[model samples]
Target: FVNNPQGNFEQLWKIIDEQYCFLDYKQIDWDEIHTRYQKLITPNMGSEGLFEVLSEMLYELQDGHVNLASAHNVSYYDAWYQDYPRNFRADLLEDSYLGRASTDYRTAAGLKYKILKDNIGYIRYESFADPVGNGNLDEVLSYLSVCNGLIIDVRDNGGGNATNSARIASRFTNEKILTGYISHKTGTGHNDFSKPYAIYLEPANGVRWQKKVVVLTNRRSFSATNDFVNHMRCLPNVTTIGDKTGGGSGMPFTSELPNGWSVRFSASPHFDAEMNHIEFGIEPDIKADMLQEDELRGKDTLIEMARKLLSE
Candidate 1:
C-alpha cells in the first residue's frame, strides 16, 4: 500500500513475480494502483488517502491482529484476517441461571432469581484483560463453586491481557495447563509444561468443582481467550459447543513500526498441557453449527442446544 512507484517497487514486484494478479509492473498503469496513488497524493506524491495507503499495508503480512480502532483502549477494530477465519480461539458457555449467577457465590448479574435451576451452573467471561478479584471473574468462579454444570462464554471476546486467561483456566481443571515455547526479540526461548492444559483440581486445596461443563465458542473469540478455551477443551468432562473458535493461538506482543502503525504480533509460541501447539485451536467433541440466518437474527441456538443436552 505504500505506493512509491519509483522509490521502492519491491512490493509491486513481489506481486508480479508470483504471477497471480497479472499486473504489469514494467508498464505502470497510471489509472490503476500507481496512477491512483499519484492522483490522491500531492504533486510530490508524499501525502495520500488514509484507506489506500494504510489499511492494506498492515495486512501485507496477512495478520489481522494489528489494527486501528475508534478509541485507544479495549474495544477496537477486530483486525482478524479473512482466509484465517478463526479469530480468537476461545469457548463461550451459557445456561439458564437461577437468576444471580457469578463466581461471587454471594452476588449475581442481570436480575434476581436465585434457585440454581436444573442444577445447570453457568459462567460467562469476556477477556483475560484484567487482574484477579478486581475483574469480573471472581464472580464467575464464585458460582462455579456451587454449580452442577458450568458454561463459560467467550464469543465476542477479541483477546486481551493473557495473564488472567491462564489463571481463569486454572479454576476449570487441576494440572499443568500448558508448556510455553517463548521466543523473545532477543532470540531467546524457554519451554514449560509437558502435560496437557488440564487442571490438577484435586491437589490444589480448593479446586473440587468437577461438574459437567459446557464451553461456548465462536469464530470471533480470539487470542488469550482462545488460549483459555483450548486449555479447557482437554478436559474429558468439558464439552464445547457453537462454531469453531478463533485462532489467535499464541503468546503475542506489540512492536511499534516506523510508520507509526503499531504492529501487534505473536512472537511467543505456546503449547497446551500436552505439548500440542494451540495455534489452530483444539477440536470440539460436539460441534454445533449455528446457521448464518439464525445468527443474523441474534439467536444463540448452540447455547439452547447444550442446555437441552444437559437437562436430559
Candidate 2:
C-alpha cells in the first residue's frame, strides 16, 4: 500500500502508463508529463496537495474516460467542450416543441416521442442507460408510421449501454449494415492493441422506420451515443445534422491506486466504418447549429432544418 502521497502519485501514473490505451493515439507523452508534474510534488505536500497535482496530471490526457476518484472529490477533464458553443437549451425545446414533459410526449422503450405539427415524427432518446426492447420500438414506430419523416435527437446524451444503441439503431435500417470496428488491449504498452473486429447492425426483427430519418447530435453526445451516430450515419436514408459528436469511442474499465483511489479509463478503442479513429469525434452529414435568433423565436434550428429536409 502507498503510505505516502508521492507513492500514490507514482503508483497512479504507472497504472495509467500501462493499462491506459490511448497514450499513443492521444499523443500524450507519459514520461514528459511525469517529469513536469514531479516538480510540483514535494515530500511535505499533504493529501490535498497530492490530489490536486495528481488530478491535474491525469487531466493532461484530455480523455473523458479518465478520472481519479477519491472520497473527497473526483477529477474530471472538461476541456472537451469548455470553449465550444453549448448548442442545447432543454427549456426552450420542451416549451416550444416537445411540450410539457409529462403531457405532450409518450414514453416507451426509453424514448420520448411526439408528432410535430408538420407531420414529422420526433423521438428523443435521452440516454442509453435506459433499456429499450423490440416491443417498445415496434410500438413507437407503429404510432409514427404515418409521418413523412423522423427526427431522433440525442443531444446532451453522455451515453450508456452500447447494446441499447445497437437495438435502437437496428430499427432504422432495412438491411444488414456494417457500423464500425473495435479493438482491445493485448498488453500494457500504449501500442499493445488487438486486431480490429467488425461491428454490424442486424435489421430489427419488428417495426422499422422506412422514411428519411435525421439524427441530431452535439458535443455532449458521447460514447454509446457516438457509436449510435456513426452507426446511423452509415445507413441509406439517414442524415446526421448539427455539431460534431463528443467522441469517447473507447470502452472503459476501472482500476485502483495503492492509496485506494479508484481510476477509470479506456482499455479498448473503436473506429468508424472507414477504420478512422473516432476518439476525437464524428462529423455530421450536414453542419448546422442552434441559431440564437431562431431560439428567441421559439424554434430549434436543427429540428426546423430536419422538418424542411424531410418535407422536401
Candidate 3:
C-alpha cells in the first residue's frame, strides 16, 4: 500500500467497482454515492488526499462491519494491512517466513509452546476473526500443557467474524462465561458459550492449569480483542496489562472507494461474552503503562508486569 502509488489505487477502484457487488447493501444509493464520488475524486488530490474521501464513502455504509481508514490513521493502517494476508490473520501467526518466531517457543515431540522464563505461558492468539474458534483449543492446549501461568497477547489484533470468544474460554474454567445478545430482526440472537463446555484435559501430558494469566493489550488491539479483555477481566486469575485498547469494536468491517483507496470502520457496539460493552476503551485490569521515553528506548512495560505478577 505504501509503494506502487497509481497502480494500487487503480486496482482497488476496479475491484470495488466490478467484483464487490456487496450482495447485502443493495439500496446503498450509488447515486447518492455518485454525488459524493464526483466531489471526492476530483483531480489534483494527492495519494493521502484521496483516503479521506474514501473514508467518508465507507462511513455511508452505516454498518459496524464496514469501513475505510483514511490518512490520519495511515501508519496504523499500513501495519494492519501488511501484518497478515487476506483470509489468514496476523494475530494467529507466531512464526515468520524465514522461520523467525515473534513468540518464544518451547516444544516437546511435535507440539509447540511459548513458555517464558517467568512461568508465564504466552499464547498469542491469531485473530478474533477466526470463523472456527475451534483452533483456539489447540493454542490453549499447547500453552497450558507446560506452564501454569498464561499470557494471551493481542497487541495488534484486528477483528474477526462471529462471536468465537467463548469457544476456547470455556476450557479455562467450568463456570458460565458470558452470552452475547446481538440485535436481530425479531429481537436478539444470543451467542452463548456458557453451557457445559468440552474441556479435553489430559493427565498424561496436560493438567488443569488454573494459573494466573496476564492478557497483553495495546491501542492497536481493537474489536474482538477489546471484547476478550472485557470478558477476561471478570475472572479472578486474569488481569489485562498495558495501554487502553483501540476501541474500534463495532461489528467491524472493510470498505473502499471507486478509486483504489481502502477504508476500515468501527460502528457496531462491542460487547463482551457477558454483554458488557467497552465502547470507550478497555482500561487495564492492572494499569501498567509504557511512557513515551521508554518506548523510544525500546523497553517493554507489559513484559515486566507479567513477570512481576508471577512473584505475587
Using all chains and alpha carbons, the TM-scores for the candidates as numbered come to: 0.60, 0.92, 0.54
- Rank order by TM-score, top first? 2, 1, 3
lDDT of 2 by residue, 36-59 (tens): 887887787877888899988988
Best by lDDT: 2
Taking the tens digit of each residue's C-alpha lDDT, what string does model 1 give over 98-165?
22245522332311212245566655555555344423444555545665566666665767663555
Q: Show how many residue pairs clash in every candidate, following the order shown.
A: 39, 0, 14
lDDT measured at residue 197 in model 3 versus the true structure, 0 to 100: 24
Off by over 4 Å in 2: 1-3, 42-44, 101-103
Candidate number that wins on TM-score, 1 or 2: 2
CA displacement after TM-score superposition, residue 242 of candidate 1 (Å): 1.4
RMSD of each: 9.2, 2.0, 10.2
- Residue 213 lDDT, candidate 3, scale 0-100: 75
Clash tally for model 3: 14
